[PDB]
Write an enzyme that holds these catalytic residues in place. Structure first.
Site, short mmCIF file in Angstrom:
data_model
loop_
_atom_site.label_atom_id
_atom_site.label_comp_id
_atom_site.label_asym_id
_atom_site.label_seq_id
_atom_site.Cartn_x
_atom_site.Cartn_y
_atom_site.Cartn_z
N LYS A 164 -13.65 8.92 -5.72
CA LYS A 164 -14.95 9.33 -5.18
C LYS A 164 -15.39 10.70 -5.72
O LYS A 164 -16.57 10.89 -6.08
CB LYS A 164 -14.92 9.36 -3.64
N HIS B 72 0.78 -1.24 0.00
CA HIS B 72 0.00 0.00 0.00
C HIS B 72 0.81 1.29 0.00
O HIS B 72 0.24 2.37 -0.16
CB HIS B 72 -0.97 0.01 1.18
N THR C 293 -7.84 6.89 -3.07
CA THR C 293 -9.18 6.44 -3.44
C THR C 293 -10.17 7.59 -3.34
O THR C 293 -11.18 7.60 -4.05
CB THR C 293 -9.68 5.25 -2.58
N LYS D 108 0.91 14.33 1.93
CA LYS D 108 -0.33 14.71 1.23
C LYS D 108 -0.43 16.22 0.98
O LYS D 108 -1.29 16.69 0.24
CB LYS D 108 -1.56 14.19 1.98
N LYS E 249 -8.85 14.11 3.67
CA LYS E 249 -7.96 12.96 3.75
C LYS E 249 -7.18 13.11 5.05
O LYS E 249 -7.16 14.19 5.63
CB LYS E 249 -6.99 12.91 2.55
N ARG E 250 -6.54 12.03 5.50
CA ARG E 250 -5.71 12.12 6.70
C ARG E 250 -4.65 13.22 6.59
O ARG E 250 -4.11 13.45 5.51
CB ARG E 250 -5.07 10.77 7.03
#
Ligand SMILES: CN1CC[C@H](c2c(O)cc(O)c3c(=O)cc(-c4ccccc4Cl)oc23)[C@H](O)C1
Ligand SMILES: CN1CC[C@H](c2c(O)cc(O)c3c(=O)cc(-c4ccccc4Cl)oc23)[C@H](O)C1
Lengths: 810, 810
Positions: free
Chosen positions: A654, A351, A650, A548, A542-543
């Site tokens: 969405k 992952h 992901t 990120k 998102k986290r």
């Protein structure tokens, strides 16, 4: 009301009403005079649950008679969210229940909001497991999800003084109507002890025993009458445990602590003993269950023909040496045969390539906790390295690079290396990611066994992520092309022939506006915050992570604010910038990023010169149920990780399915999304993986960008001087220092291109018709990113099973 | 099959069968192919439970509309046993369910054996609370039992090598179908903190909060459609509890430990902080609930007219200062008015005069845990002692004797003194006991407030303790005098006119023989032990205690064995001597007594010369469900406590109702039993209370008896020399030493009379017809000992409410 939600027949509505009343009376022991909204929720949940049971019993009976190959999906996380609406959707009950509750004087949407999320995951990895279960059931596979029933899931996030606070997610407080306890299938799990060698092999003795009690939850397929099982294990002390008297009973908590709480770390390895216990606990209980079921169909040659085990990351990697232990020590198979069976049974999904997420367990921990497993791992390592030495003679550095045992200050076991050695297939989760695996971190392994390496690009379920959360969009699509796309998302391509259809353009834009109004209303009701629904909804959910790059978003927000202040009477496209997500409790920098976001909002939202042209909101307690609300309302999806760091993502998928345009780097699945939609229909910016590599060779110097970009200099000066924290001028010193001196994720290097690209976003938004036409081109090409496609590929290319859309008899 | 078990109508049986099948399918998620006997038990339990709910809802609605005075029975123990059969009996469903299950191919008795006991008590005190709840519901009183839902009840006793071993009673493992969780009625309970004094009174601040979550269990009356509630509190940590992250979540166990385990002490005070927390926890949560309900009917003058609080022993004594705290600190009433209300609301039941059972809490514990309550107690004490000083001027020793505060090495609070001061009624539990209270330990209090002191002789419910456990006896009685005696046990007197009825004599003796055969069969099936069913069943079942004198029984057993060995070819009436009961885990002497019993059995049961003339069996894991099996099978009931030590006893009453004759001292309720039946129909022996007093004045010298009784000397020599423990000759040295030098309970002093009296028992047993005629005279006069009589007296003489046998509409 709307077609895709099913029929509300006279017989069905009458039956639902009476069974609702029965449950209120007999199950909840209430009448209408004392019943609370929560009582009504539970009466509905029990009523819908009744419709599952017949299908659930006959599905499992069907598997017993046909004896197909079984798929066992092992994960430490299943991020399920709410279950009520999902169950109604998959059973075609939504309109019938809406009507039945309406006639009873109740609003079903209000009742749906009472259900707690099953928050048994951190983010992407856990939500992927949940989408996968849905797709496996929809594709008629004999699949089982196996995990841990945590008493406490991911913490509830509160924002206090701009800071994240954590509180226990006591999700089971009012009970869980969906699960069925199965104390009769309780299994023992062993810890500690020592290894004895006898005339007839090794024996693991003097162990401490913890019981594993299973709880089963139904997983319904989409309108195919298939109901699969998610089995979650709960830890129980044996009755003779520590058996002064009172203390011995109280000490039972120590054993039961194993299933108490989910580790709240996203893509980060914390080497704690309790975590290791959780990982073995799920593996040991699961494998006994698998073997028992296999025997109840002596000869383990047929084991891989009847069993597939999928490892979701390295978390359940102990499945490999545990399977060897059972086969060798208990079943008395020779090593070579047991190993052949193990390899053919197991497959491993990676992952992330980020080093801090990689599981490397200290030898001394495994030595104490799992002595026999350590011995088996050493033996696996010896035999594997003998193969490497025979393939690449004299290459001594390769031997050390590929070893499962890492030497150093403390010896560690590399669990990823263990997984590759003991699996017949290894996959990444997006094309770029899988290529990176073969080229960089697992290059040595790829050269030895190239056939092992595969790609399986991630996906999301269109049931939860379109029909459930965005019925308005699902309906206007169904009006044009029918309902078959819900289980065959590639059919969305048919929407390309409507890109110049004036009615469709109007309808797509109308559905978005309604979603935005609904969400703007949600914000005032639950959080008393005022937003302009005519503004561009710019969202990054998102986290919270350095990789990120929520910080890059922050820099843009400040740039916009500074530009407005410089030329107040100039027109700008109004934006509502929404950022949300949880930080791991011990991740200091991520907690500082949250504080920065709220601090920017405090300045921006109260500047009279700005007006309602720019708003910055931190979305508190981001979780699956919140995602279902905000994603349909979004105009712009922020997917801005440094190239080569986000394996897939992901959340990106969405947003694409729900009519938002994407601003993003060529990272993870963004690459394939842009390829499907066309690069002209995507807002791509920034360094590619190759550009990042070139900058690393040269050395990244953040000062260079600071020196040459005046707008960036101003922001750093503002942060440093206390513009965003007047009472604590040095509050963001750590953030500035990191950005200037130790930024592994090159925030400054992408700043100029990002800001430029955002200007192009605002320009397009000024032209509503052309904005919407680009939206249609995104939705129309989102089909590849259905988890039905992903699961069909796992089935055919890894598991050796054929998916089926055929209905079982109702 | 038999009349008293109700009708098996066509409509009812058909309905039960279909609802059984519904629960198996929808509730248990099983079909007939995979269902286990336990699944069948649960399907039946849910089916019967459905019949309660309508009645339960309408009973509580009835109380809301009529607003009667409510009775709150506070106890730390409710020893409920199994619920399935009891519910069927009280609802007249037993024959219908027996038929329905038979037609389904199931044996109902087999299913009944699957249910776990609710073992939330130690013995007599806890079982009394359970009988009381049954009687209160049968007498139509608006009554509520309030206690703690312990996760672990009284330990399961295993015998290993002749020694007691304890294991956790995990009674909730498979779930409890009878309870309904009520998380919506959760209440906060406060601990620790400190007291602040303000302009407007005292304030309790900086406290730690534990949540109290209620679970409700239905309590059905006997065929009157009344269903009352037992509400048990469970401890829950608040969600912000201790809120690194992981440890804070794990530390929630500390708060939840409050309701984890029942203290396994019978008539013994252990001064542990955890116990004090349990006592406050139940009191604080209960009192909030009471006050809330009272307000939902400002003016607390009417409080005692609408509320009665019964304290079962001193365990919930904190109700007194807690009620004062709420009324004074929160409701702002003046002290004198609050006190008047408190006194008129509370009543206290004393259960023992033994000093080691008396609750005397260290001041320093209450100081830390409950600072405001300590201050209130001091103020209660000051005002009370001012009353004493005004009544008895200059009597300074009386002041110190009556103080709630005991001075010494550590200052302590006498909770019994607190209870007397703050209650309008104080009762003992048998006539002799209540007189002892007034004459000895509470003499000072009786002289000050004589009107306060009452007697309420204990009782047992004839539903559980006759109809349920002995249907064969209940039927033959009903054949003669009808069914009305079941709720009016005084009607058993009508059986006196059948004492010369040859048919009845034969039937009584036949029912006993059948019970004995059934129990002899139970012993072989579950414990592989062989007994002669034609022998006299001599049983002593009760908690293991020095005061209850299992040791005196042991001495008799050895005497019989020694007599047989001396004259082997002489005829003796064959006996099976059964002794059972649990020892508190820390009670060393009681654990030694158990070992002695098993050690005697090991010698006696394997001596070929003895044959099946004498057998000694230790009944393992004595508990309510075992009592229901052994008591109907008994011929001789051993009730042999030292006079003045057993306050009442209730086991004695169970044996009397079930056709056993009693050998006993004039202690507790034995006195009233002999008075009811006639002393000619009772085997009374030994010192009276007056004789014990005379021996104490003189000084008890055990050596005197040893010197003058040769048979006793032989037994002591055998014990000392290792006759009963050959491999450990000195095993019973502690027992011998105690008997010879420090026996507070005068075992030797009653030995001769006991042995002589036992000879008279054997003589009567040789004449079956005259044995049975005496039995009939016992059963016929057992009516007084119904808990319906006891509860009617509490109602009229303490609570100020009138009982009712009138049915509610079904
Ligand atoms: C140098 N130090 C920085 C902080 C880091 C750290 C923590 O101390 C605590 C944490 O909870 C996290 C976390 O959740 C995720 C990541 C992480 C994960 C992936 C990529 C990069 C990073 Cl920094 O790092 C964490 C670790 O101690 C190494
Ligand atoms: C001197 N010592 C003797 C043992 C006693 C003791 C223990 O140490 C531990 C126990 O669990 C008990 C118990 O359960 C009951 C009684 C008891 C109760 C009533 C009357 C007489 C007695 Cl001895 O005593 C107990 C206490 O320590 C005082």
């Amino acid at each position: 009301q709307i077609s895709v939600r099913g029929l509300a027949g006279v017989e069905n509505v009458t039956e639902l009403k009476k069974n609702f009343n029965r449950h209120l009376h007999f199950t909840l022991v209430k009448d209408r005079n004392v019943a609370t909204p929560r009582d009504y929720y539970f009466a509905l949940a029990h009523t819908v649950r009744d419709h599952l049971v017949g299908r659930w019993i006959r599905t499992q009976q069907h598997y017993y008679e046909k004896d197909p190959k079984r798929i066992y999906y092992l994960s430490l996380e299943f991020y399920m969210g709410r279950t009520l609406q999902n169950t109604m959707v998959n059973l075609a009950l939504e309109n019938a229940c809406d009507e039945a509750t309406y006639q009873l004087g109740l609003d079903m949407e209000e009742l749906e909001e009472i259900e707690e999320d099953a928050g048994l995951g951190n983010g992407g990895l856990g939500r992927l497991a949940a989408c996968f279960l849905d797709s496996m059931a929809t594709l008629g596979l004999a699949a089982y999800g196996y995990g841990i029933r945590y008493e406490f899931g991911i913490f509830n996030q509160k924002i206090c003084g701009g800071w994240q606070m954590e509180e226990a997610d006591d999700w089971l407080r009012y009970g869980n109507p969906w699960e069925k306890a199965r104390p009769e299938f309780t299994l023992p799990v062993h810890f500690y002890g020592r290894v004895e060698h006898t005339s007839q092999g090794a024996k693991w003795v003097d162990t401490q025993v913890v019981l594993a009690m299973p709880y089963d939850t139904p997983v319904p397929g989409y309108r195919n009458n298939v109901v699969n099982t998610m089995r979650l294990w709960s830890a129980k002390a044996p009755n003779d445990f520590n058996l002064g008297y009172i203390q011995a009973v109280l000490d039972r908590n120590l054993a039961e602590n194993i299933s108490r709480v989910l580790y709240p770390n996203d893509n980060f390895f914390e080497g704690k003993e309790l975590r290791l216990k959780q990982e073995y606990f799920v593996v040991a209980a699961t494998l006994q269950d698998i073997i028992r079921r296999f025997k109840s169909s002596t000869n383990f040659d047929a084991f891989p023909d009847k069993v597939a085990i999928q490892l979701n990351d390295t978390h359940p990697s102990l499945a490999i040496p545990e399977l060897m232990r059972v086969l060798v020590d208990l079943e008395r198979l020779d090593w070579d045969k047991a190993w052949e069976v193990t390899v053919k049974t197991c497959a491993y999904t990676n992952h992330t390539v980020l080093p801090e997420a990689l599981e490397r367990w200290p030898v001394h921990l495994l030595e104490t906790l799992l002595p026999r497993h350590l011995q088996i791992i050493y033996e696996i390592n010896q035999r594997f390295l003998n193969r490497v030495a025979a393939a690449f003679p004299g290459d001594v550095d390769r031997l050390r690079r590929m070893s499962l045992v890492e030497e150093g200050a403390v010896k560690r076991i590399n669990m990823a290396h263990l997984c590759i050695a003991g699996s017949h297939a290894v996959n990444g989760v997006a094309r770029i990611h899988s290529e990176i695996l073969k080229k960089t971190i697992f290059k040595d392994f790829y050269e030895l066994e190239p056939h092992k390496f595969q790609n399986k690009t991630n996906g999301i379920t269109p049931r939860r992520w379109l029909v459930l959360c965005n019925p308005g969009l699902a309906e206007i699509i169904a009006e044009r092309i029918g309902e078959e796309y819900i289980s065959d998302l590639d059919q969305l391509r048919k929407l390309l022939s409507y890109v110049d259809d004036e009615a469709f353009i109007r309808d797509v834009a109308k559905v978005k506006q309604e979603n935005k109004l609904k969400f703007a209303a949600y914000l005032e009701r639950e959080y008393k915050v005022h937003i302009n629904p005519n503004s561009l909804f710019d969202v990054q959910v998102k986290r919270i992570h350095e990789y990120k790059r929520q910080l890059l978003n922050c820099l843009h927000v400040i740039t916009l604010y500074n530009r407005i202040k410089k030329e107040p009477n100039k027109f700008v496209v109004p934006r509502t910038v929404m950022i949300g997500g949880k930080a791991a409790p011990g991740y200091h920098m991520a907690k500082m990023i949250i504080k920065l976001i709220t601090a920017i909002g405090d300045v921006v939202n109260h500047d009279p010169v700005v007006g309602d042209r720019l708003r910055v909101i931190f979305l508190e307690n981001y979780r699956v149920s919140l995602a279902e609300k905000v994603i349909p309302a979004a105009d712009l999806s922020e997917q801005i990780s440094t190239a080569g760091t986000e394996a897939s993502g992901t959340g990106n998928m969405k947003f694409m399915l729900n009519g938002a345009l994407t601003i993003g780097t060529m990272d993870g699945a963004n690459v394939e999304m842009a390829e499907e939609a066309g690069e002209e229909n995507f807002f791509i910016f920034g360094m590619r993986v190759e550009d990042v590599d070139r900058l690393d060779q040269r050395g990244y110097n953040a000062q260079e960008y600071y020196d040459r970009i005046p707008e960036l200099r101003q922001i750093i000066e503002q942060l440093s001087s206390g513009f965003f924290s007047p009472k604590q001028p040095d509050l963001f010193k750590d953030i500035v220092n990191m950005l200037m001196h130790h930024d592994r994720f090159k925030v400054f290097a992408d700043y100029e291109e990002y800001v430029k690209c955002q200007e192009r976003v605002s320009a397009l938004y000024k032209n509503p018709r052309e904005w919407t036409r680009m939206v249609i081109r995104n939705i129309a090409t989102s089909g590849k990113f259905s988890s039905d496609r992903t699961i069909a590929q796992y089935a055919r290319e890894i598991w050796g099973v054929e998916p089926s859309r055929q209905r079982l008899p109702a």
